[PDB]
Ligand binder design. Structure first.
Ligand SMILES: *[C@@H]1O[C@H](CO)[C@@H](O)[C@H](O)[C@H]1NC(C)=O
Ligand SMILES: *[C@@H]1O[C@H](CO)[C@@H](O)[C@H](O)[C@H]1NC(C)=O
Ligand SMILES: *[C@@H]1O[C@H](CO)[C@@H](O)[C@H](O)[C@H]1NC(C)=O
Ligand SMILES: *[C@@H]1O[C@H](CO)[C@@H](O)[C@H](O)[C@H]1NC(C)=O
Ligand SMILES: *[C@@H]1O[C@H](CO)[C@@H](O)[C@H](O)[C@H]1NC(C)=O
Ligand SMILES: *[C@@H]1O[C@H](CO)[C@@H](O)[C@H](O)[C@H]1NC(C)=O
Ligand SMILES: *[C@@H]1O[C@H](CO)[C@@H](O)[C@H](O)[C@H]1NC(C)=O
Ligand SMILES: *[C@@H]1O[C@H](CO)[C@@H](O)[C@H](O)[C@H]1NC(C)=O
Ligand SMILES: *[C@@H]1O[C@H](CO)[C@@H](O)[C@H](O)[C@H]1NC(C)=O
Ligand SMILES: *[C@@H]1O[C@H](CO)[C@@H](O)[C@H](O)[C@H]1NC(C)=O
Lengths: 228, 208, 342
């Protein structure tokens, strides 16, 4: 049975280099090229390159040319990957793979039946940044005896996560805290909303409690109707 | 070179997933399955040949440059993300997630102007809320003085609610303070099966 | 009527029974004499499919060359399987002779004579022969030496050009000499000389042919990305010694775009410790012999690998190297296939 066993996950800072290993067994190691594929959530799987144990011949993906190195150790039958000048875009799970068809005479490289378990690599700054909390006012419309919507926008924080409660957890019904989104600036942001009766806007006080443990930040924000 | 569609399928156990991939070049195409927290697995290679262990519920087809993976009678272990592949090229992926069925429900739409506190900074965020709708499929379009917006918006969607089985979506339009004060009508347009016609929520900058 | 088939071929040569030269000694016990009056029948109204990349003639020659080298180029020390073998390692006489491969009774070799045949697909002009032409088992990397030339235009060969994992063979129609020398009186230092005027014109013709295959994109050459010295350098054997030559100057993009017109000299070294191309391990050989060591060869082909990746660039990049040693035999066996008579 063909097996590929990869080394443990790791955390890195931008500027660092990284090395991961892929130990193979269950077949003639020198006959088959080994590939490296990385996966990040929301993005295409990205082929980094292949490496042939015979001679250590390599072919790197154009967009990684210069920053990637693929080697191997014949005796321990272990393939190695190195990636230099790490940035946030290198955050991913890294896999070594091998094609389904491989004999002593021939191979087809691209039908990846054999995968290692994968090696999680996170690249991020050690810096933290607390959120800015802006109110999403209930607006001066939406019926008189119906339901109004309100919330707060939790913008430009790093890293994940933030949590939001309302009125110290006393308010839970109709509350929706959305999954955060990553902005172009590299900072996160999310919204938390709650639907309440419109007739309670002039009586009940609504406060969102924003928690951000990495920056040691706890912020309360009162969301009230705009005065005009 | 590899265009995979759709982005997301929200289906119930027993239904069929139809996943397509359009290529600009012919040659052996493969399909992969990635379960949550697990390495991807080869499902199909060479267009329609099943890998070992793969049940006949999975099948591959091709019409012209369009390749299709169909998954009939969806089981628990079938849900996850699927990728098509040609040589070193992969598709964007298709997320197949579990959807619990209920009656169609139109979203309640709310639009939120930028706060005055935020406008002091230099950027303006316009938030549009789509609350408690079903099914998941919904389109949001931003209009500024009746001009379609693209490239300046981000969306986020909640998991299907464990009580009422609805979804909620949030879309944020981001502009500079200067650009925000250049226009009057800020509108956000929602299209959903539960609405007889597209619904638009808007506000005029300056007036309450 | 016939059909494509595989069988145990036999080899023929003109080896001298008196020669101490290694290839001659091997062919003396392994091969039979050649045929003075070879017969070739040009089949008319016959179209046949060929595939140089799926030709098992290649496998048999590989086994022969391995058998030859293993039995003739024995090292002082062999490091393999975690164990150490110590043997005698005398200097030998080494110079490849032509080897013909032939089919036994019931089998015949079909030969494609289409001048522009690229290695795969249908062939209009097919003839029938009993033996291939004389093929010298020249073991080398990056550059193909002392082989046959393409009759008309330069030919690009690959099982699949869209597949970056598939080797590219460039078949030249004009040979260019490479003159390698280890002078008499560091003993391990050497060099190869090439007429840059001739080579650059040929290399220009290569890129123009490559443009026909890659939508008139800008063709760019680059050095190998990595690997052992056997693949990152021009590796070959000259008079028994193992040469490693740097080919960076051979693929100068500036010259195929003022100054490159002249003599190109590649830095070379002779190594006593090598990785065996038989895929075994490390071998230790004795120091080089004294006097001038020289090999003048015909560059008749190039081994290339093309860069891939999920990119969107207006230029294709090619690097010296290719696949493995079996590809050397492929480039000479490309126009042949074995068929069984009924
Ligand atoms: C090239 O590869 C495709 C599949 O990737 C295959 O169908 C085709 O036959 C190959 N071409 C040749 C000439 O072998
Ligand atoms: C095949 O032979 C005919 C007959 O002489 C010749 O005219 C033709 O050019 C040849 N074709 C090729 C591809 O060599
Ligand atoms: C060789 O010629 C055949 C025509 O039968 C074509 O399909 C194939 O792509 C060609 N290969 C190269 C490398 O030009
Ligand atoms: C070799 O082929 C090229 C085209 O690929 C041609 O321009 C050149 O004249 C040929 N050289 C010969 C036939 O000597
Ligand atoms: C090398 O090429 C020249 C002309 O290109 C030829 O005359 C010579 O015989 C070749 N060397 C061989 C066949 O050993
Ligand atoms: C090869 O180069 C040497 C100089 O290193 C020279 O003496 C010799 O004449 C050259 N051989 C040929 C055939 O040009
Ligand atoms: C070949 O020579 C070039 C020129 O300096 C050098 O950069 C390169 O590292 C050399 N290649 C090897 C494999 O030593
Ligand atoms: C390429 O040729 C130019 C002009 O002769 C020369 O200046 C340059 O050093 C050469 N580069 C290499 C890598 O040989
Ligand atoms: C290179 O060969 C050409 C003939 O193609 C010749 O005219 C030229 O003198 C040669 N260059 C040198 C440096 O010998
Ligand atoms: C190529 O052939 C020539 C003459 O036949 C010979 O001197 C030279 O050593 C050969 N080259 C190799 C690499 O065998």
């Amino acid at each position: 049975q063909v097996r590929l066993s990869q080394s443990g996950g790791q955390m890195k800072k931008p500027g660092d280099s990284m090395r991961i290993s892929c130990r193979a067994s269950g077949y003639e190691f020198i006959n088959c090229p080994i590939n490296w594929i990385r996966l990040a959530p929301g993005k295409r799987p990205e082929w980094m390159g292949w490496m042939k144990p015979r001679g250590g011949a390599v072919s790197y993906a154009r967009q990684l040319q210069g920053r990637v190195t693929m080697t191997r150790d014949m005796y321990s039958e272990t393939a190695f990957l190195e990636l230099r000048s790490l940035t946030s875009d290198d955050t991913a799970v890294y896999f070594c793979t091998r094609g389904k068809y491989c004999t002593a005479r021939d191979y087809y490289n691209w039908d990846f039946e054999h995968w290692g378990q994968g090696t999680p690599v996170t690249v991020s700054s050690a810096s933290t940044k607390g959120p800015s909390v802006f109110p999403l006012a209930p607006s001066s419309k939406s019926t008189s005896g119906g339901t109004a919507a309100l919330g707060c926008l939790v913008k430009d924080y790093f890293p994940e996560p933030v949590t939001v409660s309302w009125n110290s957890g006393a308010l839970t019904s109709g509350v929706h805290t959305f999954p955060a989104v990553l902005q172009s600036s590299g900072l996160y942001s999310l919204s938390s909303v709650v639907t309440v009766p419109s007739s309670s806007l002039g009586t009940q006080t609504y406060i969102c409690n924003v928690n951000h443990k990495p920056s040691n930040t706890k912020v309360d924000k009162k969301v009230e109707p705009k005065s005009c | 070179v590899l265009t995979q569609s759709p982005g997301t399928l929200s289906l119930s156990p027993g239904e069929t997933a139809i996943i397509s991939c359009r290529t600009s070049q012919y040659g052996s195409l493969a399909w992969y399955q990635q379960r949550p927290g697990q390495a991807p697995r080869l499902v199909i290679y060479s267009g329609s040949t099943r890998a070992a262990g793969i049940p006949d519920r999975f099948s591959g087809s091709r019409w012209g440059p369009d390749y299709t993976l169909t998954i009939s009678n969806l089981e628990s272990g079938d849900f996850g993300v699927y990728y098509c592949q040609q040589y070193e090229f992969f598709g964007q992926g298709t997320k197949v997630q579990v959807d619990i069925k209920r009656t169609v429900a139109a979203p309640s739409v709310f639009i939120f102007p930028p706060s005055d506190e935020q406008l002091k900074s230099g950027t303006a965020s316009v938030v549009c809320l789509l609350n408690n709708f079903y099914p998941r499929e919904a389109k949001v379009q931003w209009k500024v003085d009746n001009a379609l917006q693209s490239g300046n918006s981000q969306e986020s969607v909640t998991e299907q609610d464990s009580k009422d089985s609805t979804y909620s979506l949030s879309s944020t339009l981001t502009l500079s303070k200067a650009d925000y004060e250049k226009h009057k009508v800020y509108a956000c347009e929602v299209t959903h099966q539960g609405l007889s016609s597209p619904v638009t929520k808007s506000f005029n900058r300056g007036e309450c | 009527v016939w059909k494509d088939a595989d069988t145990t071929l036999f080899c023929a040569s003109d080896a001298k029974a008196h020669e101490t030269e290694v290839h001659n000694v091997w062919a003396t016990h392994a091969c039979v004499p050649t045929d003075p009056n070879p017969q070739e029948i040009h089949l008319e109204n016959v179209t046949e499919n060929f595939n140089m990349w799926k030709n098992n003639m290649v496998e048999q020659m590989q086994e022969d060359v391995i058998s030859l080298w293993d039995q003739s180029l024995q090292p002082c020390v062999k490091l393999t399987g975690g164990s150490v073998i110590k043997q005698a390692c005398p200097k030998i006489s080494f110079d490849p002779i032509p080897i013909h491969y032939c089919t036994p009774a019931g089998y015949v070799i079909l030969k494609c004579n289409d001048k522009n045949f690229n290695g795969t697909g249908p062939c209009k002009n097919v003839s029938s022969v009993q033996c291939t032409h004389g093929i010298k088992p020249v073991v080398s990397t990056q550059l193909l030496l002392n082989g046959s030339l393409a009759e008309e235009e330069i030919i690009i060969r690959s099982e699949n050009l869209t597949n970056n994992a598939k080797t590219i063979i460039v078949h030249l129609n004009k040979s260019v000499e490479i003159n390698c020398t280890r002078p008499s009186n560091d003993i391990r230092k050497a060099y190869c000389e090439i007429n840059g005027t001739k080579w650059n014109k040929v290399l220009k013709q290569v890129t123009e042919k490559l443009k026909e295959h890659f939508n008139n994109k800008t063709i760019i050459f680059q050095p190998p990305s990595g690997g052992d010295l056997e693949i990152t350098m021009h590796h070959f054997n000259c008079r028994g010694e193992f040469f490693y030559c740097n080919t960076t100057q051979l693929f100068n993009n500036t010259c195929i775009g003022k100054g490159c017109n002249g003599t190109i000299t590649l830095p070379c070294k002779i190594k006593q410790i090598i990785n065996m191309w038989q895929g075994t391990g490390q071998a230790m050989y004795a120091p080089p012999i004294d006097g001038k060591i020289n090999c003048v060869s015909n560059i008749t082909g190039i081994l290339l690998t093309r860069d891939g990746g999920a990119n969107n660039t207006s230029n294709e990049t090619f690097r010296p190297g290719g696949g493995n040693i079996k590809d050397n035999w492929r480039s000479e066996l490309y126009k042949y296939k074995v068929v069984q008579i009924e």
